[PDB]
Ligand binder design. Structure first.
Ligand SMILES: Oc1ccc2c(c1)CCN(c1ccccc1)[C@@H]2c1ccc(N2CCN3CCCC[C@H]3C2)cc1
Ligand SMILES: Oc1ccc2c(c1)CCN(c1ccccc1)[C@@H]2c1ccc(N2CCN3CCCC[C@H]3C2)cc1
Lengths: 221, 224
C-alpha cells in the first residue's frame, strides 16, 4: 500500500470502482437506492489500498463518518456531463424543478449541481476522482477518533493520505501540467472536499449505524 | 492583487491581522467576545487581497458562510500551546470540565482540541495560518452562490485562491521542504479545512436555535 507505484494505486482504485445501480414516493426510491449502494461501498472500501491494514473498529468509524460524502461524490461524478441535472441512477434523472415535493433537499440539490458543474469546468478525470473518493474515506473521520498507540494508528492513515497526494500530483505531472498548475489543481480539488463535507452534514440533518457497518464489514467468504 | 508577490501577499495578510480580544454565564461571555471579534473580522476581511474587488453582496455572502470557521481557526491557533484547553481569550481559558457545561460546545470541544493539537504536531507557522484563513474566507461560500456575472465573480475568487496556494508553496520551499514535502503539507492543511467546516456546521446548528445576511450587510456599509 505504501509500496505501490503511483500507477498501481490508480489501477487498484479504478478496478475497485462500484457498479452504477438502477432505481427500483421519491424519498423511498432514493433510500432504497442508497441502501443498495452502501453494500457495494463496503466492498470498495476493503480494496482501497491501506484501508484493510486498519483495525475493523477504525474501518467502521471511518465509513460511518464518510458514507454520505461518498454517495454524494459518486452522484456528482456521474452527473457531470449532465448540466442542470442529477443522475441518481441512469433511469432516475432529476432536474432542479423536481425536488418540488421533498422539502429540504432543495438546498442540497443546488449544492450538488454546483459541485457537479465545478468538476465539469475543471475537466475532472476518473483517475483523479477515485483518488479524491479515497481521501474522503481516509479523512472524513480521522480527526474524530487517544492512548499513545491509538495516535500511531492515526499516523498510518496520514501516511496513506500523503501517498494519495503523491499519486494525484503524479497524474498531474504525467498530463504535462507545470509544477505551479499541479499545486493549484491539487488545492482546487481538496477545497471542493470542504464543500462535500458541508453537503453531507446538511444531508445528515435531513436524514444504530455502527452495528450495520460492522456486520457488513465483517463477511464470511 | 493578482500582481502581488508571495512575500507581499504574506505582508498584506500579516498586516491585516485582527487583534486578540479579552473576555469582559459562560455562554454569555463567549457570545459577547465573538460579537466583538466580528467587527474586527470585517476590518480584516476588507484587507484580504481580492475581497474588495467583489460586489457588496458577494462580500456579504462569503462572510456569511465563513465567519464562524474564521472564529474557530483563530481560536484553535491561539490554543496551540495549551493542550487540553481552548484559549477563547487570554483571560478566558476553558478546559474540559467547563467545556461540558456549555451547550453547543459539547460536540465541538474535542474537535477543536484535535485541530489545535494537529496544528501543534505540524508546527503551523503564522505565515501559513494567515493564508489558511483567507482561503476560508474566499472558499467557504464559493459553491453556494447562476448568471454570467456570477460566473465572472467566481472566476475571480478562484484566481485569488490560486495566488494563496502559490504563496503557501513559496513559504514551504523557503523553509527548506522538498517538493514532495511541499505538496504533502499543502494537502494536510487543506484537508484540516474540511474538519473546520464540519465543526462550523455543528456549531452553527446550535447558534441558529438560540438576520445575519443583513447584519453583515450593515457592518460592511458601516465600514464605509
Ligand atoms: O447515490 C445517492 C443515492 C441517494 C442519495 C444521494 C446519492 C445523495 C443525496 N441523498 C440525500 C440525503 C439527504 C436528503 C435528501 C437526499 C440521497 C440519499 C437518500 C437516503 C439515504 N439514506 C437513507 C437511510 N439509510 C440509513 C441506513 C444507512 C444509509 C442511509 C441512506 C442516503 C442518501
Ligand atoms: O473566537 C471565538 C469566540 C467565541 C466562540 C468561538 C470562537 C468558537 C465556538 N463558539 C461556540 C459555538 C457553538 C456553541 C458555543 C460556542 C464560540 C462562539 C460563541 C458565539 C457566537 N456567536 C453568538 C451570537 N452572535 C449572533 C450575532 C452574530 C454573531 C454570533 C456569534 C460565535 C462563536
Amino acid at each position: 500500500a505504501l509500496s505501490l507505484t503511483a500507477d498501481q494505486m490508480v489501477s487498484a482504485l479504478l478496478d475497485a470502482e462500484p457498479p452504477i445501480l438502477y432505481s427500483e414516493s421519491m424519498m423511498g426510491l432514493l433510500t432504497n437506492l442508497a441502501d443498495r449502494e452502501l453494500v457495494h461501498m463496503i466492498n470498495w472500501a476493503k480494496r482501497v489500498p491501506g484501508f484493510v491494514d486498519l483495525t475493523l473498529h477504525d474501518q467502521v468509524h471511518l465509513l460511518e463518518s464518510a458514507w454520505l460524502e461518498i454517495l454524494m461524490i459518486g452522484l456528482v461524478w456521474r452527473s457531470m456531463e449532465h448540466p442542470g441535472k442529477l443522475l441518481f441512477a441512469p433511469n432516475l434523472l432529476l432536474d432542479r424543478n423536481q425536488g418540488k415535493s421533498v422539502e429540504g433537499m432543495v438546498e442540497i440539490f443546488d449544492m450538488l449541481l454546483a459541485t457537479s458543474s465545478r468538476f465539469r469546468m475543471m475537466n475532472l478525470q476518473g483517475e483523479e476522482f477515485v483518488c479524491l473518493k479515497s481521501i474522503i474515506l481516509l479523512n472524513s473521520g480521522v480527526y474524530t477518533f487517544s492512548t499513545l498507540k491509538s495516535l500511531e494508528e492515526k499516523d498510518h492513515i496520514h501516511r496513506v493520505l500523503d501517498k494519495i497526494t503523491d499519486t494525484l500530483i503524479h497524474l498531474m505531472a504525467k498530463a504535462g501540467l507545470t509544477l505551479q498548475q499541479q499545486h493549484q489543481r491539487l488545492a482546487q480539488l481538496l477545497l471542493i472536499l470542504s464543500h462535500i463535507r458541508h453537503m453531507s452534514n446538511k444531508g445528515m440533518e435531513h436524514l444504530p449505524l455502527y452495528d450495520l457497518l460492522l456486520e457488513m464489514l465483517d463477511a464470511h467468504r
